[PDB]
Design a protein around this nucleic acid. Structure first.
Lengths: 131, 263, 182
RNA sequence: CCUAUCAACUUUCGAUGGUAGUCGCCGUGCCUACCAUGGUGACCACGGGUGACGGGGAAUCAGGGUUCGAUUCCGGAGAGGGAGCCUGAGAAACGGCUACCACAUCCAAGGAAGGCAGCAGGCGCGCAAAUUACCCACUCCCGACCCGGGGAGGUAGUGACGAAAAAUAACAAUACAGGACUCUUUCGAGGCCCUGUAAUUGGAAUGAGUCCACUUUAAAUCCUUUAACGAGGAUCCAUUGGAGGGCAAGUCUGGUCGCAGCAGCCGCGGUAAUUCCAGCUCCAAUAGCGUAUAUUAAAGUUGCUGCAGUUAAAAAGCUCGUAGUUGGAUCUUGAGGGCCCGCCCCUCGGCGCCCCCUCGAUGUGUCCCGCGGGGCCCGAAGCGUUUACUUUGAAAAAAUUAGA
RNA sequence: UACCUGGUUGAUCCUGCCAGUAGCAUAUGCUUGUCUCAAAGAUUAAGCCAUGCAUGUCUAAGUACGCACGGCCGGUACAGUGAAACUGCGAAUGGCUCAUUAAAUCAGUUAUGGUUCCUUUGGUCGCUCGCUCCUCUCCUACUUGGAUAACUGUGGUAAUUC
């Protein structure tokens, strides 16, 4: 309600093909309308659709009535996918990282050391203990 | 122990004039091996994402470099922590903007856009001028570029317009009294000025009496003086903060006056 | 990283007359305890030592000039000191009171919605004011000159205007549950 | 750093040096031949001790000083102890190797494999110190590489080392105890500001809890954001020591009666205990306070600044006297402006002399001159023979610290 | 914040230490609501250690004859992708702890003209200068020689990253 997105520190970034900016959202008394709302709202300003817009940061300001965050708008989805930090993709789901996770890989790596050749053998050796 | 050289450098142990933070990050970028020594260098990353702010992760920095949109000294680099130094020109080929690094007299590396005319060449002072093997002469510049068959009248502390299109010497400027110099390092960091007199002492360490533009006079060691061209004839412009020398009071007056007066 | 105390403990623990003095300051300026008084004692002693050092430096010396002017400017910004005086000699003459008087609590008394040096502190701590459009919850604060021109009710205390919390609504339901009988 | 209840020491298995060679990434008694007899000490060597890593730095001090430094950063050193070695530019490497020694493990008894002063964890030790967790997203490192791997490192958990903010109620009413003001001769009454103490209240407020939602973030947590909730009271309810003196606050009340205890110290208690043991009241500091202990301040009770020695603790029986410390007197440098400046009893600059392209008499080249390069050589100046000192510069880690 | 105060006695003035007192750093007692910052197995055994884990690495691009997977696309060698393995590099760095050592370590200031240095960055990339051209016959240049892994099969060992 009664937001307005005011863009400090605007950057035309031609070499990562994106408009990079701070998002300053005034509110009447309660800090922060949704991240999804902000991407939609911003989307019709620069006319790029919200699906090439990512928004991150965000931290409510005491006594309400403001929230400063950060946004990026990619000219195309290809550009977004190519600068691409995993956490940014994660933030509103559409890709998340590995879920193997971690100690499975370490066990596997220790199995490979034992013998020379025979890939499949070491997989099966890692797989029998669950313990 | 200590069984070999470190491949890491911690932050809060890196040189001040790179303008990194205190303890909010536990590792500094660290320069790669290259033509300049690591104290005076400025890793590519600090320029690219801390001054020009094109990345907010390290993941992006690697991805930027692999585009190969960045040439440094006319030649195509892809190193994440390139050891750029004094009067090294960075050429962004995607935007047509050439930036060179020269000290503020504050002591902070300047973001100093130059025209692509002035980014054709850089002036490099000779470090040694070498009679090489089989009686072929070479000059060697500070930035470790060896150019064979150099002009046959040159002598030490001359400057040399190196060209970056084609390499090699593209004339030279002779070392003489009253030449422009920028005094680099020490307590005389980033000051510009003439010479006046170079005092010679046999054995190690010879001091060069410098007078700056303001008319403040000081000496430094010859080592700390870098010749940047011919007297009263710049080849690149003065950077921000004067680049000469300014007092802490004057500097405060500028800081408060300009702020809340722009926009 | 690094940390430091903001108060000081004197060398005599019982010194009756002084204890009374400190209690009187607490009464006058609405403070929590002796630690509040000690907090000002620590700051004031450092200011006097700063001043005294400068004053024994040679005149027309960059360090004395630059830091002198800075010390003066800071003390005038917070309205402790006046710039019709404006040198080291006068800074020495300042005392604990002069600081306390420029606090947020004592301004909230002098204008606005407090009735006492009691009331004021509780009002600030319960977020009844904004200094500008910015809530302040700390009564020991020290406001600057032009920050005393913007002390006013908050929009998160719902008298003086603001969104209903659950304390206005509590009073409403002493008329609709106290006197509504349900 | 401490030590003389350590005064002579270093080489027969080189101690110092010359010469020549072997050897080493390379200097060198590194090692060896031959040849010399050196080298070092009262200015503390040599020897012994050391919870002796070093620095940047830390704590307290009026100043002077004193004390601390394994411990977020830099250098060095070691990875159970010793010795040897391979790979590689770099290692005498324990998440490499080989032997032995001390430890531990498996064994079918022939054998075989091992090093948490890595991260967690356990045992032991003690007065003393946390998760057998999650993640490579950040910060950087490595690789053939954006892509992978990281107990580097990030993240949470544990966390009254210690630091920061400062709540646990605030405002009226009335019932009273009070004072400026007014009226009254005063007594008395009215009167505003309230402080407490009743009786309860009246609105008025706020998170401690509780909680959709938005936010956080690797994904989460908590914070900072908020619909709906959360204060009339012995409560949503604070503590820890003290009250004889030093010492702040009991000429307390009951109990004990030199008993139990108190008591750093001085001293209380033996019957009318203001020190005890309880209660009550009060004081001090207040989400903290008590206690033990090291160290610092106070302490001019280690006295450099800045001690004392007739009698209080303290001038050798006396003199000579070397080191050591300390040391008498005595040499020259007028204008300008209303002090300030240079002076007196050859590499440069340049008064000049001679040279060259020559600068005006001239256009390999003069007679104004060394002016640009020279030589020689005056006011100037190495001047005469050295300094310590003091003064200006540089060289002079970041964090810290003062401080913008 | 440059401080002192209590105790030798009949009383008094001194010398004097003792006790009080504040800082601080650990320990410990007791208590403890909310917000932020975080030091933390040094002391004492550089004691001993179960288990888990802390260093690995591929670009169109050194080297694919996977039991692979998928193709129509097949011969000259032919595949797109790719477990593996060889090759090259890291593994000396990182992290940890301060036992050891008294001009040793180390700090600051200097040196290497006494020496070694992968890598990166910049130069250096035809030749025997014709053996007075074997290199015009030394005529393999349209390119030489032959063996290991992974693989396939047979296996040994009470137990081995054998």
């Amino acid at each position: 309600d009664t937001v307005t997105i005011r863009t400090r520190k605007f950057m035309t970034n031609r070499l990562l093909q994106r408009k990079q900016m701070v998002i300053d959202v005034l509110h009447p008394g309660k800090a922060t309308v949704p991240k999804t709302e902000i991407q939609e709202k911003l989307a019709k300003m620069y006319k790029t659709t919200p699906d090439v817009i990512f928004v991150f940061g965000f931290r409510t300001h005491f006594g309400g009535g403001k929230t400063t965050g950060f946004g990026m708008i990619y000219d195309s989805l290809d550009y977004a996918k190519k600068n691409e930090p995993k956490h940014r993709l994660a933030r509103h789901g559409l890709y998340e990282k590995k879920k193997t996770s971690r100690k499975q890989r370490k066990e596997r790596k220790n199995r490979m050391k034992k013998v020379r050749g025979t890939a499949k053998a070491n997989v099966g050796a890692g797989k029998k203990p669950k313990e | 122990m200590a069984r070999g050289p470190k491949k890491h450098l911690k932050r809060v142990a890196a040189p001040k004039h790179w303008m990194l933070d205190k303890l909010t990050s536990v590792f500094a970028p660290r320069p790669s091996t290259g033509p300049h020594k690591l104290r005076e260098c400025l890793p590519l990353i600090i320029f690219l994402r801390n001054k020009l702010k094109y990345a907010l992760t390290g993941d992006e920095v690697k991805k930027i470099c692999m585009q190969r949109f960045i040439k440094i000294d006319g030649k195509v680099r892809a190193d994440i922590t390139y050891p750029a130094g004094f009067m090294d020109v960075i050429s962004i080929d995607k935007t047509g903007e050439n930036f060179r690094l020269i000290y503020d007299t504050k002591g902070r590396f300047a973001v100093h856009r130059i025209t692509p005319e002035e980014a054709k060449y850089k002036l490099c002072k000779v470090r040694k001028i070498f009679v090489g093997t089989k009686g072929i002469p070479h000059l060697v510049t500070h930035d470790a570029r060896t150019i064979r068959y150099p002009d046959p009248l040159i002598k030490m502390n001359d400057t040399i317009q190196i060209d970056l299109e084609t390499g090699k010497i593209t004339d030279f400027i002779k070392f003489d009294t009253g030449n422009l110099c920028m005094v680099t390092g020490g307590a005389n960091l980033g000051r510009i000025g003439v010479i006046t007199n170079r005092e010679r002492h046999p054995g190690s360490f010879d001091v060069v009496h410098v007078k700056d533009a303001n008319g403040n006079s000081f000496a430094t060691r010859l080592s700390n003086i870098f010749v940047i061209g011919k007297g009263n004839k710049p080849w690149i412009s003065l950077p921000r903060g004067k680049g000469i020398r300014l007092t802490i009071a004057e500097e405060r007056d500028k800081r408060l006056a300009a702020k809340q007066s722009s926009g | 990283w690094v940390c430091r105390k903001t108060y000081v403990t004197p060398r005599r623990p019982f010194e009756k007359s002084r204890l009374d003095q400190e209690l009187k300051l607490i009464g006058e300026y609405g403070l929590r305890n002796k630690r509040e008084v000690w907090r000002v004692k620590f700051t004031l002693a450092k200011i006097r030592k700063a001043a005294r050092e400068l004053l024994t430096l040679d005149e027309k010396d960059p360090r004395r000039l630059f830091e002198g002017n800075a010390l003066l400017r800071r003390l005038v910004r917070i309205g402790v000191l006046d710039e019709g005086k404006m040198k080291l000699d006068y800074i020495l003459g300042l005392k604990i009171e002069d600081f306390l008087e420029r606090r947020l609590q004592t301004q909230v008394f002098k204008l606005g919605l407090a009735k006492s040096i009691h009331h004021a502190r509780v009002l600030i701590r319960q977020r009844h004011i904004r200094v500008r459009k910015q809530v302040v919850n700390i009564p020991s604060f020290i406001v600057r000159l032009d920050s005393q021109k913007h002390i006013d009710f908050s929009l998160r205390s719902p008298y003086g205007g603001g969104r209903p919390g659950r304390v206005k609504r509590k009073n409403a339901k002493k008329g609709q549950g106290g006197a509504g009988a349900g």
